[PDB]
Amino acid sequence: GSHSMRYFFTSVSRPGRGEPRFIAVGYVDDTQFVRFDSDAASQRMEPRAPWIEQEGPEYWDGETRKVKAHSQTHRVDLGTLRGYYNQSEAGSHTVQRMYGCDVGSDWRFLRGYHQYAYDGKDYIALKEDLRSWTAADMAAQTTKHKWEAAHVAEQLRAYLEGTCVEWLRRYLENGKETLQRTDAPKTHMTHHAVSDHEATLRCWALSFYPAEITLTWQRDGEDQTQDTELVETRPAGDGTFQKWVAVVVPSGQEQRYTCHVQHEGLPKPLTLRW
């Protein structure tokens, strides 16, 4: 199916002394493959998946250099943005950046993105066409003009349609054994009673990859959303994901209710019953 490469960067200013805390992570699909943390000892980009370890010392030198450049742009940005917004030196502030590319089942370019936030709000983002910018306010509008003059969009577009896609394909091939494998959810159902009239049914999906999944209840063959609780998809910690959906039902009527599970690792949707 489709695939992505995405990088996520957070910098948090430390007012009293020194440079900001900087954390960078890279993902292929739902798999983290690299990291840099400014508070760690190595001051190098670090592997987080075995297949990226195939890369040679030049890759690690080149990635380290770039990630440090990312860090310094963020450092400068925090000062510029404090200036744009007339803020003091006392408070802590945050910049967040995410960029990357999508490819479809054919591994051809589908979509590219580059978005930027200050204190948890939209600041500026590259538009879908990769030719123009969305600036949320007048501070971001000043950045937009700066970036138009410097032809920033043009450089980003070349990366997003070129290098990004080229290297995602490369990672997908080298990590084929896990990255191109689907892990179907392991499903089961639990039952609890609150009183002698009311029961809770919980439909579980465990150990699945990719993260994307749909879990729903039906009652007598029709979609049931009232009296349901659906939790956020959560990491198991071993690379796979978990989720559940519960429904409250009258004791004795459990049989009317079916759980339905859709996942790319399942050629057909699965049905569970109590």
Binding site: Y7, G26, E63, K66, V67, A69, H70, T73, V76, D77, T80, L81, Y99, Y116, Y123, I124, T143, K146, W147, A150, V152, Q155, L156, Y159, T163, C164, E166, W167
Partner: peptide, 9 residues
């Protein structure tokens, strides 16, 4: 593979 250049805001 990270983007080569990151323009300042």
């Amino acid at each position: 593979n990270l983007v080569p250049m990151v323009a300042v805001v």
